Scaffold this motif. Sequence first.
Motif, PDB file in Angstrom:
ATOM      1  N   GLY A  26       0.814  -1.194   0.000  1.00 59.08           N
ATOM      2  CA  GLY A  26       0.000   0.000   0.000  1.00 59.08           C
ATOM      3  C   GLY A  26       0.854   1.252   0.000  1.00 59.08           C
ATOM      4  N   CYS A  27       2.139   1.060  -0.238  1.00 60.36           N
ATOM      5  CA  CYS A  27       3.130   2.123  -0.198  1.00 60.36           C
ATOM      6  C   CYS A  27       3.527   2.504  -1.601  1.00 60.36           C
ATOM      7  CB  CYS A  27       4.401   1.658   0.512  1.00 60.36           C
ATOM      8  SG  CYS A  27       4.146   0.741   2.064  1.00 60.36           S
ATOM      9  N   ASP A  28       4.437   3.430  -1.677  1.00 60.55           N
ATOM     10  CA  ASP A  28       5.026   3.825  -2.933  1.00 60.55           C
ATOM     11  C   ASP A  28       6.357   3.134  -3.003  1.00 60.55           C
ATOM     12  OD1 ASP A  28       6.817   5.858  -4.601  1.00 60.55           O
ATOM     13  OD2 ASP A  28       4.734   6.415  -4.987  1.00 60.55           O
ATOM     14  N   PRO A  29       6.814   2.754  -4.195  1.00 61.20           N
ATOM     15  CA  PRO A  29       8.078   2.042  -4.333  1.00 61.20           C
ATOM     16  C   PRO A  29       9.238   2.838  -3.739  1.00 61.20           C
ATOM     17  CG  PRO A  29       6.904   2.077  -6.436  1.00 61.20           C
ATOM     18  CD  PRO A  29       6.126   2.936  -5.482  1.00 61.20           C
ATOM     19  N   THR A  30       9.011   4.138  -3.563  1.00 62.90           N
ATOM     20  CA  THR A  30       9.981   5.022  -2.942  1.00 62.90           C
ATOM     21  C   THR A  30       9.716   5.117  -1.444  1.00 62.90           C
ATOM     22  OG1 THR A  30       8.707   7.085  -3.241  1.00 62.90           O
ATOM     23  CG2 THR A  30       9.985   6.265  -5.101  1.00 62.90           C
ATOM     24  N   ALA A  31       8.637   4.480  -1.028  1.00 63.18           N
ATOM     25  CA  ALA A  31       8.347   4.271   0.373  1.00 63.18           C
ATOM     26  C   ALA A  31       8.777   2.864   0.773  1.00 63.18           C
ATOM     27  CB  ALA A  31       6.860   4.472   0.649  1.00 63.18           C
ATOM     28  N   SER A  32       9.862   2.780   1.530  1.00 65.56           N
ATOM     29  CA  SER A  32      10.375   1.512   2.024  1.00 65.56           C
ATOM     30  C   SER A  32       9.273   0.748   2.741  1.00 65.56           C
ATOM     31  CB  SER A  32      11.555   1.766   2.971  1.00 65.56           C
ATOM     32  OG  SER A  32      11.993   0.574   3.599  1.00 65.56           O
ATOM     33  N   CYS A  33       8.866  -0.379   2.170  1.00 63.48           N
ATOM     34  CA  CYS A  33       7.817  -1.180   2.766  1.00 63.48           C
ATOM     35  C   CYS A  33       8.384  -2.196   3.721  1.00 63.48           C
ATOM     36  CB  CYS A  33       6.972  -1.903   1.721  1.00 63.48           C
ATOM     37  SG  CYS A  33       5.932  -3.241   2.417  1.00 63.48           S
ATOM     38  N   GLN A  34       7.770  -2.229   4.873  1.00 60.53           N
ATOM     39  CA  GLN A  34       8.048  -3.216   5.889  1.00 60.53           C
ATOM     40  C   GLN A  34       6.747  -3.909   6.224  1.00 60.53           C
ATOM     41  OE1 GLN A  34      11.425  -1.891   5.714  1.00 60.53           O
ATOM     42  NE2 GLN A  34      11.581  -1.577   7.928  1.00 60.53           N
ATOM     43  N   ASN A  35       6.701  -5.214   6.088  1.00 58.51           N
ATOM     44  CA  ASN A  35       5.525  -5.939   6.508  1.00 58.51           C
ATOM     45  C   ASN A  35       5.608  -6.263   7.979  1.00 58.51           C
ATOM     46  OD1 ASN A  35       7.598  -7.505   5.189  1.00 58.51           O
ATOM     47  ND2 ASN A  35       6.293  -9.313   5.207  1.00 58.51           N
TER      48      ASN A  35
END
Length: 99
Positions: free
Chosen positions: A58-67
């Motif tokens: 649900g983030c932007d690819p430039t938003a580091s996603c952490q599950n």
Amino acid sequence: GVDPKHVCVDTRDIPKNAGCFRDDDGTEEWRCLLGYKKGEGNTCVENNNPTCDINNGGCDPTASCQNAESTENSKKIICTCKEPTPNAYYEGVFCSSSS
């Protein structure tokens, strides 16, 4: 190219579990807040079982996603916009890397 604070004016009716952002290019889009998913095409709904995979959770690819898994759905998917993205589109659902 600018710091992601572009804000938005989009779409007639943007979903309640959603937010719209009008980007650098002049685009007008809306997405589904963190910990939410897409319902009937143009609706956002609390997912409460978000996975990183789906648009980075649900983030932007430039938003580091952490599950992650938290009592809050919005605290499950961690969206972190990096240094060249001092701002976030809503909660980090999207970000801009050109500031």
